[PDB]
Amino acid sequence: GFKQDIATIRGDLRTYAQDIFLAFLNKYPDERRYFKNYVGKSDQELKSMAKFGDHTEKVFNLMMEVADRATDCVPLASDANTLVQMKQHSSLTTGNFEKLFVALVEYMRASGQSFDSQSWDRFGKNLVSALSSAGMK
Amino acid sequence: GFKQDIATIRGDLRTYAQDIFLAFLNKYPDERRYFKNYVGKSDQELKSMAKFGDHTEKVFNLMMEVADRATDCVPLASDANTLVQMKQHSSLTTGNFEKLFVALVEYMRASGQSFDSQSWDRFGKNLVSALSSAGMK
Numbered sequence: 036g037f038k039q040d041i042a043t044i045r046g047d048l049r050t051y052a053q054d055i056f057l058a059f060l061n062k063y064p065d066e067r068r069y070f071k072n073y074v075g076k077s078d079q080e081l082k083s084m085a086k087f088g089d090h091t092e093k094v095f096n097l098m099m100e101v102a103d104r105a106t107d108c109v110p111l112a113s114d115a116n117t118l119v120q121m122k123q124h125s126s127l128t129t130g131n132f133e134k135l136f137v138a139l140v141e142y143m144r145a146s147g148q149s150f151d152s153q154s155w156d157r158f159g160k161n162l163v164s165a166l167s168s169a170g171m172k
Numbered sequence: 173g174f175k176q177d178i179a180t181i182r183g184d185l186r187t188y189a190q191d192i193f194l195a196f197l198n199k200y201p202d203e204r205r206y207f208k209n210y211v212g213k214s215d216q217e218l219k220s221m222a223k224f225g226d227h228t229e230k231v232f233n234l235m236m237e238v239a240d241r242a243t244d245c246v247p248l249a250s251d252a253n254t255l256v257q258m259k260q261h262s263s264l265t266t267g268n269f270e271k272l273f274v275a276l277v278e279y280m281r282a283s284g285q286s287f288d289s290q291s292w293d294r295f296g297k298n299l300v301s302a303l304s305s306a307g308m309k
């Protein structure tokens with residue numbers, strides 16, 4: 036289930052993080068406008084950029100912590116507040132997060148691993164609801 | 173064949189019981205709802221809970237007794253009845269049992285080991301038939 040999925044991702048985090056983030060960017064190419072220097076590059080080009088791996092790993096490090104601190108796929112209010120208040124997230128709306136979790140869930144469903152994709156969908160929705168409660172537009 | 177598979181499983185009953193049960197919960201995550209104590213725990217956390225190892229082994233011990241008492245993968249009517257009348261199974265249907273056997277068969281096929289998976293599938297089918305006759309919804 037969900038808790039074991041956290042351990043699974045953590046066991047091979049950089050690989051999962053890059054693959055999920057690439058799934059997100061490829062499904063939603065216009066989301067690249069939030070990032071510098073990602074446009075005009077193939078998956079393999081991005082994976083060789085030193086910033087790409089390091090930053091995607093940091094995102095998913097924190098995403099896994101938020102998932103881990105959750106109860107029944109409900110994140111902590113303080114974790115949601117952190118995500119809203121981060122300067123790097125100042126221009127974002129909940130829709131950006133919805134798209135990320137659509138891509139993540141689709142990746143899990145298409146994978147050869149036994150992810151509890153429904154729980155990740157629930158977590159994504161609960162996170163969006165928490166982001167809204169915390170004041171994200 | 174089937175008789176040897178019983179010997180293989182019995183030889184390391186705790187490991188097989190835990191592995192097959194987790195394969196079941198992973199393939200059918202909604203089934204975890206029946207095990208309120210296992211909700212939101214990692215596989216490793218589960219393995220450290222006395223009742224997880226104890227009760228899972230006891231489940232598979234009984235499964236092996238039913239298996240061994242069968243003739244050509246046809247279980248005894250009395251064994252089917254035991255499973256239906258158990259208080260712990262009061263809210264279950266034959267669908268819960270088919271799911272378990274689907275996961276068990278997939279586990280066997282995915283292992284490198286020479287399980288008689290076809291026989292286990294047939295045993296599952298025959299047991300489900302016997303459960304319905306014994307009154308299971």
Ligand code: HEM
Binds near residue numbers: 091123124
């Ligand atoms: C639960 C989901 C998310 C988590 C846990 C998260 C977390 C983080 C973290 C920890 C960083 C710092 C990375 C670093 O400095 O190396 C970061 C940066 C950033 N994030 Fe988020 N983030 C999430 C979702 C999103 C989404 C959906 C977007 C936009 C579609 C986004 C846009 C950005 C941007 C533009 C930066 C700074 C630029 C960059 O790192 O390349 N984040 N995020």
Ligand code: HEM
Binds near residue numbers: 232264
């Ligand atoms: C042939 C298949 C099965 C056998 C032989 C079997 C046998 C057993 C046994 C011996 C116990 C008592 C364990 C103990 O208290 O130590 C038990 C309990 C229980 N079983 Fe079944 N079972 C089977 C299938 C299922 C299925 C498919 C479900 C539903 C997903 C289920 C749900 C439960 C629950 C909720 C308990 C109570 C918790 C526990 O004491 O383990 N069982 N079963």
Ligand SMILES: Oc1ccc(I)cc1
Binds near residue numbers: 091094135
């Ligand atoms: O650097 C990154 C990578 C992925 C995400 I989602 C946000 C920022």
Ligand SMILES: Oc1ccc(I)cc1
Binds near residue numbers: 193227228272
């Ligand atoms: O305690 C348990 C474990 C596995 C099963 I299947 C039923 C009850």
